[PDB]
Amino acid sequence: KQFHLRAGKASYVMQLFRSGYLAHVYWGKAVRDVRGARAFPRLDRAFSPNPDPSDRTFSLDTLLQEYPAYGNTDFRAPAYQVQLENGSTVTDLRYKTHRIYKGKPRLNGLPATYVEHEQEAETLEIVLGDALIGLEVTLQYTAYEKWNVITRSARFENKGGERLKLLRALSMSVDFPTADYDWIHLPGAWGRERWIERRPLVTGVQAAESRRGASSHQQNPFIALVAKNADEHQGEVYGFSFVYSGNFLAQIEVDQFGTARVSMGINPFDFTWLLQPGESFQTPEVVMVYSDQGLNGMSQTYHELYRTRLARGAFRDRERPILINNWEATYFDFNEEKIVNIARTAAELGIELVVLDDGWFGERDDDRRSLGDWIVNRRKLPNGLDGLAKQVNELGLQFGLWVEPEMVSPNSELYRKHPDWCLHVPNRPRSEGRNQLVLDYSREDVCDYIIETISNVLASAPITYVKWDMNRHMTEIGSSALPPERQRETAHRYMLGLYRVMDEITSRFPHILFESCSGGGGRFDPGMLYYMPQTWTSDNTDAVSRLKIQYGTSLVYPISAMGAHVSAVPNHQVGRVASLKTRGHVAMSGNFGYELDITKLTETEKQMMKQQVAFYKDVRRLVQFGTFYRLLSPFEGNEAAWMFVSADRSEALVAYFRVLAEANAPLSYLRLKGLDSNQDYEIEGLGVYGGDELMYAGVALPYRSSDFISMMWRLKAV
Amino acid sequence: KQFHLRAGKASYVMQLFRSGYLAHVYWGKAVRDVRGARAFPRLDRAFSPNPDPSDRTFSLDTLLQEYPAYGNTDFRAPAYQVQLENGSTVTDLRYKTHRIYKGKPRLNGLPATYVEHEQEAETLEIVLGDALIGLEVTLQYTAYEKWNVITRSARFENKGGERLKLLRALSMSVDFPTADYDWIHLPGAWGRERWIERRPLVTGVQAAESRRGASSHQQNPFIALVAKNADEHQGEVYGFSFVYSGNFLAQIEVDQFGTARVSMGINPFDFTWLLQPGESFQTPEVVMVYSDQGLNGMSQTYHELYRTRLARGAFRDRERPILINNWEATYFDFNEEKIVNIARTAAELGIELVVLDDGWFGERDDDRRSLGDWIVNRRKLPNGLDGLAKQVNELGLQFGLWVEPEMVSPNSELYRKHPDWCLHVPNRPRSEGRNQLVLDYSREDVCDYIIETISNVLASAPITYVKWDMNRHMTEIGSSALPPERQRETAHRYMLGLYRVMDEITSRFPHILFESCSGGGGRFDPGMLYYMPQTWTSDNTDAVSRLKIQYGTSLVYPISAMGAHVSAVPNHQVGRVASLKTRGHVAMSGNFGYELDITKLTETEKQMMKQQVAFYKDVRRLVQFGTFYRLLSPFEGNEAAWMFVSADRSEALVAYFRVLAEANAPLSYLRLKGLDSNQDYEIEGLGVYGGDELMYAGVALPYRSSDFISMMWRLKAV
Amino acid sequence: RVASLKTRGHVAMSGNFGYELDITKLTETEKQMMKQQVAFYKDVRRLVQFGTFYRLLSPFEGNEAAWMFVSADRSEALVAYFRVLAEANAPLSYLRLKGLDSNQDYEIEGLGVYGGDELMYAGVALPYRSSDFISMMWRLKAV
Amino acid sequence: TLQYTAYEKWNVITRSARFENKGGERLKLLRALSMSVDFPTADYDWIHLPGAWGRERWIERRPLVTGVQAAESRRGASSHQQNPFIALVAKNADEHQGEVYGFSFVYSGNFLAQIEVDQFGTARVSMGINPFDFTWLLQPGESFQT
């Protein structure tokens, strides 16, 4: 009774134990068969009680499990918890049946990785059931053929005659036989998202989570287990990525016997779900990647999967336009003439898209009003969105628009008419963030209004680009349309509403490239990537600051989705002053664009920016769709380096950065990766060198002074 | 509007902010007055929402709090959470009044540190209230005069007109302004309890907890924050000890801005508490200790407080008897004559107490039956407990008895008669640990039965010693005597029942020395220490294994409560063979005793054991009540060392251990601590040496071969 | 590297103070700054060059660097703090002093009278500043 | 003649040697260090001051290996590369606490600051004029001060 999933060059093995217990066996590099070499001597462990009183060698406290529960002799953190009408939380799920089919199913009202053909992957569904309460839980496993990817999710169903209350419903759980690992998560904040933090495991609970109703800047829904001696270029790494943009829990628990339980899913804190007879609950999925070639190996797998099989729409495989956003340039102080003034200068540079940011609607001259009133400000924009867009188009440039549909200002016509459409609880003060409130997307009437309202706006002008922003986190979570026993479903139902709203709007406008945003990387997660193929990385547009941010972000997400804009100096967020050359090279390492007043630059500055746009277009296909390698970490030292290699290893682009200068510094060298050692590559401006020489010996770096310096090399095989 | 508590040479500072917000200010070395030198620049932090929309610089996400909540702009883990009838979990507590009085209050139905006179400490009660729901929360602070001890606890009271459901009720919470700290907790298992684990903090959640309905071998209810450069002998250390024997949560959360939230209390997992209007809830307390003299400084504070002001009874300040237990000696295979045979041999050695272990009652010839039937086995003990005790007494020895009143075997008359007296949930299989079940101590009838039954047993013979054991952990938590809405109160109510049972029995028999036990240190916590002045440290009686176990245990608990027995070889738990001399030196470093068949030992062994008993009696008052210093850690290397110093520094005892021998090893040296540098000390058998020499230069350690060696030194001031 | 004149002074004032640049080609802003600089160091030349020196934060370990000069009678002190690299939405800091009198109240010129124990056990809150290469300097006088 | 001086006010010990040829035959000094001291244990870190021009005297705190660690100059000066100063610090010592043993050379030429950990965990700290490319001819009646 053994299940063996084959995902790329990896294996995932499970087996049925005794009477319908599902046990974890092996996850790692592909083996032809697990015959039992690494057995599991079942022992009578002290204080670990037995469900079967006759056999003291069996306890759920000592069994490596796929979807464990609490109360039936297991004392470790459960993957799920159900409360009965009698008050008891004891549930025992045992094997019922299973099915195996080619392909991968869609998840209801949720984003998930997909396939274009059934032959791309195989899906295993293991059905568990609790006979007493009529609870059925179907565990979904999918293994891709081409990649080392394993996806897991769960579906609950009440086939009984009583109501069941889900106190906790995590997406997955896995028990490693050893705890000798480090773990990596991505802590951060606004302006500094997704910094890499590697630490050795401790005996107890280590966890990253979000209670903010969104993925968050503070913790990204991603954790990884790494071998003690593993690095960027080698070693075993086990990644876990959550495809969900709301509250989450990412937890690793090490027990008394040195096993490590990794569980991930919707945060059980402040969460319940009521299942009336006939009702079901589908959890979001988690994408698991194994790699023996280190962190770069894992990252590259995620990059291909998320770019080709997560992102959707017409722009999935299309090169992304170089855009200009006016946010840091004008903020709220702008007019129609100012925008067209910027559009003409952008046209001279070769910029392809002009994006109109916040402040175009209602009475928006500040961030204290007008959210929810989505109608053109005729004072700022006399000819409306139609006129402005048309004026940009005749310059041969696309036009884009900024929106924040999930929010409503207390000072707005929408709120005066429908004050109860926001998230709130009875008789409690309504707290505000950035002087705005969150709309109740758990209500159908609200969602319907938003879908139609936004559709009207997008159909009023030739808009080919949309920036969806979110600048606040939920407080006073509650809905007037929900009964008391369903109140704790508000946070999740909110996200389900948003997902529906986005799917409908994006469907009505397939010619529009959507870029998700949340004060930067507030919701940079696989969930949002499913609806909008690219994301605004961070509101911190400083070149040096972006080194850490982009390095950390590239750990999971593809470069194609990583937005990067060249901004003004001194930087608005940090104050730092870095050269336009250095500011360019960092931004070119992601989805390239500009965010600054281009009407105010010198002809000397216009010439360099002109060269930048021209250069990036040449390497655009390489950067956005090529293979990414991280070389030097800004978290570990004074340097940062990475490179892009084409699929056929015939083309390459190398970027190097050094932040702090010191006098009489020793010489530097950089070894490359991902090239073909049997081929010679011409480094433009230097000469032809062997791939083996470039990777094994390295390249001498030029001695250079001042702080925050950059250099870039294009490589082409002979 | 500032509260400043002074506990010994430490300070604890709070202050009211705006409209009744209670904020944390400072905890550390005593300062005469906090004027604000270390201010707190109030900032507008991105995505941190505002309770007052006019002021963006105020958020509960950025405010250091004493008892924080979630949902009112705070996103970090709350100290408490309340669910209303409308389904909302939003609660707003604000200042109402406060009270200050000399002394320390008793906690309702709970153990807590005490005072014998009001002037020993001062108590501050801060009363908070939520006007909407009529919820009142009284925060209790107590500061001792002579020690750096701060105790914290909370009391909820429902003064509203609806029922309130407590989802979480922790004892305390504190926000450190920085997160640059390591943290220490005590992970373990059966046979290896309380190993010391020091680790650097991570950005996220670090937690040690118990879901077993007991303190546990796996995690001890203690955590501490330590400065990066702090050690055993220096640096700032902040300890947190939970006075509770049930489920607990000890958690440290580091947020985006580098603050550290330390929270401790009853585990919110599988826990709710219903407050009908007019009902109250008292949380257990947490003992907070500050020390700038390193880990030993903190430990020594805990030792005096717990020994003199936590432990109770006639044996609080009295020397503890050297005992012999027959468990490892005979197990279940013994009779009346066998006990007297070991009792006679014990008399020759100088042993003062003979303890009859498991197997004396019902039909218990194995561990599968008879729990709950507490009547003498007349086949094994013809003359009963009465006859046996008197037979021991006429040899001049005390008599003791083993009991496990919290458990019932399915195979017993008690279970046949009252099958519903156990902990269970409807229509679910009743899981067993060690073939036994847990009695429902949340029921008053059950508690009443045990009190009467055990009292009858205890009054049937001249018993002056009792070992209270529990060899199983709770599963299927539920009570048939509780309504569905109170079902999740079972675990806590169970402990409240037990506490009542223990308090009543110990009151009826003040002449009996009680030793708590739970398969060793399963319940080694301040809660049990309040009822029983000593505890059985571990079922692992190996000398080398005990090095780690006792070292870790001494971090919080006093040596007087730390039981240690000399056992047979090869060891029953690990297999190791170590000299009788070394087993003694390890055992003499705690509460000394013997556990092996003394009728079967060689004359060579009889000579040493005779000498050991003689020796320990001389240093008994010094060991159990003297000051303890740790010198070498078995967690850090191949050696372990510690020493006992008298209060007046005129007497000392030093113990040294080396586990693994290597050939041609270098010479070793040991430096002492806690002595008076201005006095000369005679090392018995060596010579007179200066205290300054012994501490600054050190003592030469003996060159020796073979494995597992020990040495002991007595010091006497001239 | 381009650092502020304020910073270049504060670091130089932590030693044998002097100048080395064409002072004839300076802006009146720089000239005015240097006039205040010279007068400042003159007022505490004895304290710096002949006082007790304490290191607090090492530039070989973190992103910060700090030290302080304390007199013989510990009646007067001078604290210097430095931060090199900057980051958005940075966490706040506090610096704990050394070598003071715990039972003596001190007056920090610009802030207010504070206890010696509070400065060593609790610390001094470090102000939020953007930009690279930042320098602060507190002066302490007993009452 | 081994020279030791103990200041009453400070914790300072100064050491130096004075050779003297009171024989009839010539003596050749291949090595003449100012001092040497054998520590009973070697559970220490060690701090020296390496660097170069434009970055003199950076702090390197590293644990002791079971061999020889050396900071020296062969440039006829104290050199920017290695300052004549090494220190034995305890494992748990920082700026504010801990046992620290300093060794400072009063000489502006070629030097050798060397620590040697033997098979028995004993540390020998040596400091003086660099023996490399150095000899001193002592005629009968002559002397040499370090």
GROMACS .gro file of N, CA and C in nm, chain B residues 26 29-39 41 43 45 177-178 181 236 256-258, chain C residues 89-92 94 96 102-105 113-115 117-119 121-125 128:
model
  132
  744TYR      N    1   1.004   5.033   3.085
  744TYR     CA    2   1.138   4.985   3.118
  744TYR      C    3   1.138   4.871   3.219
  747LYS      N    4   1.788   4.696   3.550
  747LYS     CA    5   1.855   4.739   3.672
  747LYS      C    6   1.788   4.864   3.727
  748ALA      N    7   1.784   4.875   3.860
  748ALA     CA    8   1.713   4.983   3.927
  748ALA      C    9   1.763   5.121   3.888
  749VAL      N   10   1.670   5.207   3.848
  749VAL     CA   11   1.700   5.348   3.826
  749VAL      C   12   1.617   5.432   3.922
  750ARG      N   13   1.675   5.541   3.970
  750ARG     CA   14   1.607   5.625   4.068
  750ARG      C   15   1.481   5.687   4.010
  751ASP      N   16   1.487   5.729   3.884
  751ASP     CA   17   1.371   5.790   3.822
  751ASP      C   18   1.385   5.783   3.670
  752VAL      N   19   1.277   5.750   3.600
  752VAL     CA   20   1.277   5.752   3.454
  752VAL      C   21   1.216   5.882   3.403
  753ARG      N   22   1.301   5.976   3.362
  753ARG     CA   23   1.255   6.106   3.316
  753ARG      C   24   1.224   6.104   3.167
  754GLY      N   25   1.280   6.006   3.096
  754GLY     CA   26   1.251   5.991   2.955
  754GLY      C   27   1.373   5.995   2.865
  755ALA      N   28   1.492   5.991   2.925
  755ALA     CA   29   1.619   5.985   2.852
  755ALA      C   30   1.611   5.894   2.730
  756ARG      N   31   1.561   5.773   2.752
  756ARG     CA   32   1.526   5.684   2.643
  756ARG      C   33   1.381   5.711   2.604
  757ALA      N   34   1.362   5.810   2.517
  757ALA     CA   35   1.228   5.847   2.473
  757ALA      C   36   1.166   5.743   2.380
  759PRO      N   37   1.032   5.842   1.988
  759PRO     CA   38   0.985   5.925   1.877
  759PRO      C   39   0.864   5.863   1.807
  761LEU      N   40   0.608   5.787   1.542
  761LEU     CA   41   0.626   5.795   1.398
  761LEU      C   42   0.504   5.744   1.323
  763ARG      N   43   0.408   5.505   1.086
  763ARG     CA   44   0.459   5.383   1.023
  763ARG      C   45   0.361   5.334   0.917
  895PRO      N   46   1.206   4.689   2.372
  895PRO     CA   47   1.229   4.787   2.265
  895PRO      C   48   1.326   4.736   2.158
  896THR      N   49   1.408   4.638   2.193
  896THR     CA   50   1.500   4.577   2.097
  896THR      C   51   1.486   4.425   2.097
  899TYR      N   52   1.882   3.973   2.120
  899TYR     CA   53   1.889   3.884   2.236
  899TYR      C   54   1.899   3.740   2.190
  954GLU      N   55   2.313   4.061   3.147
  954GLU     CA   56   2.173   4.077   3.183
  954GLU      C   57   2.089   3.958   3.136
  974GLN      N   58   0.834   4.372   1.284
  974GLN     CA   59   0.904   4.442   1.176
  974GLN      C   60   0.998   4.552   1.223
  975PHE      N   61   0.974   4.606   1.342
  975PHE     CA   62   1.053   4.718   1.391
  975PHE      C   63   1.148   4.679   1.504
  976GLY      N   64   1.174   4.549   1.514
  976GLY     CA   65   1.275   4.499   1.606
  976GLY      C   66   1.237   4.498   1.752
 1525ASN      N   67   1.212   5.302   0.656
 1525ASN     CA   68   1.129   5.247   0.763
 1525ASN      C   69   1.212   5.171   0.867
 1526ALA      N   70   1.329   5.225   0.899
 1526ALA     CA   71   1.422   5.160   0.992
 1526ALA      C   72   1.367   5.157   1.134
 1527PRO      N   73   1.408   5.056   1.207
 1527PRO     CA   74   1.368   5.035   1.344
 1527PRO      C   75   1.439   5.138   1.424
 1528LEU      N   76   1.396   5.166   1.546
 1528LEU     CA   77   1.458   5.268   1.627
 1528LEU      C   78   1.570   5.212   1.710
 1530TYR      N   79   1.860   5.267   2.066
 1530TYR     CA   80   1.902   5.341   2.184
 1530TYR      C   81   2.044   5.303   2.225
 1532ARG      N   82   2.334   5.287   2.522
 1532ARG     CA   83   2.359   5.284   2.665
 1532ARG      C   84   2.501   5.330   2.697
 1538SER      N   85   2.643   5.659   3.874
 1538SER     CA   86   2.505   5.613   3.882
 1538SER      C   87   2.422   5.695   3.980
 1539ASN      N   88   2.488   5.753   4.079
 1539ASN     CA   89   2.419   5.832   4.181
 1539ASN      C   90   2.432   5.983   4.158
 1540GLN      N   91   2.453   6.021   4.032
 1540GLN     CA   92   2.468   6.162   3.996
 1540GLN      C   93   2.382   6.197   3.876
 1541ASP      N   94   2.304   6.305   3.888
 1541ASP     CA   95   2.222   6.352   3.777
 1541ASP      C   96   2.305   6.429   3.676
 1549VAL      N   97   1.789   6.733   3.192
 1549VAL     CA   98   1.858   6.667   3.302
 1549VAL      C   99   1.812   6.522   3.317
 1550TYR      N  100   1.908   6.430   3.313
 1550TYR     CA  101   1.878   6.287   3.324
 1550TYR      C  102   1.967   6.220   3.428
 1551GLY      N  103   1.920   6.108   3.482
 1551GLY     CA  104   1.996   6.034   3.581
 1551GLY      C  105   2.109   5.955   3.519
 1553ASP      N  106   2.218   5.670   3.613
 1553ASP     CA  107   2.177   5.530   3.607
 1553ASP      C  108   2.089   5.503   3.484
 1554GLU      N  109   2.005   5.600   3.449
 1554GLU     CA  110   1.916   5.586   3.334
 1554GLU      C  111   1.995   5.582   3.203
 1555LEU      N  112   2.106   5.655   3.200
 1555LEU     CA  113   2.189   5.663   3.080
 1555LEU      C  114   2.272   5.538   3.058
 1557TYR      N  115   2.186   5.216   3.219
 1557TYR     CA  116   2.106   5.095   3.232
 1557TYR      C  117   1.990   5.092   3.134
 1558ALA      N  118   1.931   5.208   3.107
 1558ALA     CA  119   1.820   5.218   3.013
 1558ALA      C  120   1.866   5.261   2.874
 1559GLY      N  121   1.943   5.369   2.869
 1559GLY     CA  122   2.001   5.415   2.744
 1559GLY      C  123   1.945   5.546   2.692
 1560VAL      N  124   2.003   5.596   2.584
 1560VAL     CA  125   1.959   5.720   2.522
 1560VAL      C  126   1.899   5.691   2.385
 1561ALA      N  127   1.774   5.733   2.366
 1561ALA     CA  128   1.705   5.711   2.239
 1561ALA      C  129   1.776   5.782   2.124
 1564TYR      N  130   1.560   5.935   1.468
 1564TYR     CA  131   1.545   5.881   1.334
 1564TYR      C  132   1.598   5.982   1.232
   0.00000   0.00000   0.00000
